[PDB]
Swiss-Prot record:
It comes from Homo sapiens. The gene is ARHGEF6. Acts as a RAC1 guanine nucleotide exchange factor (GEF). This is Rho guanine nucleotide exchange factor 6. The chain holds residues 160 to 222 of 776 of the full protein. It comes from the Eukaryota. Interacts with PAK kinases through the SH3 domain. Interacts with GIT1. Component of cytoplasmic complexes, which also contain PXN, GIT1 and PAK1. Interacts with PARVB. Interacts with BIN2. Identified in a complex with BIN2 and GIT2. Interacts with PARVG; the guanine nucleotide exchange factor activity of ARHGEF6 is essential for PARVG-induced enhancement of cell spreading. Transmembrane segments: none annotated.
Length: 76
């Protein structure tokens, strides 16, 4: 069998440093703020959700917590 896990592949990533948002459209993180990646783009920006926040942000910058997401970019 296999029986996947249909629910949410949200990616938990912690901010890196004081990151100011260029616009409200984008996200904004400071420090110690786990963000939830929903989009997950390889273009360069990453769209997720922060504690009562949202928008796009640099994933490369922020750190990754999920160990099942690191070696598992969703699917491919």
């Amino acid at each position: 069998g296999s029986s996947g896990s249909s629910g949410s592949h949200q990616l938990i990533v912690k901010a890196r440093f004081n990151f100011k948002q260029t616009n409200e459209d984008e996200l904004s993180v400071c420090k110690g703020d786990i963000i939830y990646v929903t989009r997950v783009e390889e273009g360069g920006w990453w769209e997720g959700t922060l504690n009562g926040r949202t928008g796009w942000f640099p994933s490369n910058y922020v750190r990754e917590i999920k160990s099942s997401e690191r070696s598992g970019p969703s699917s491919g």
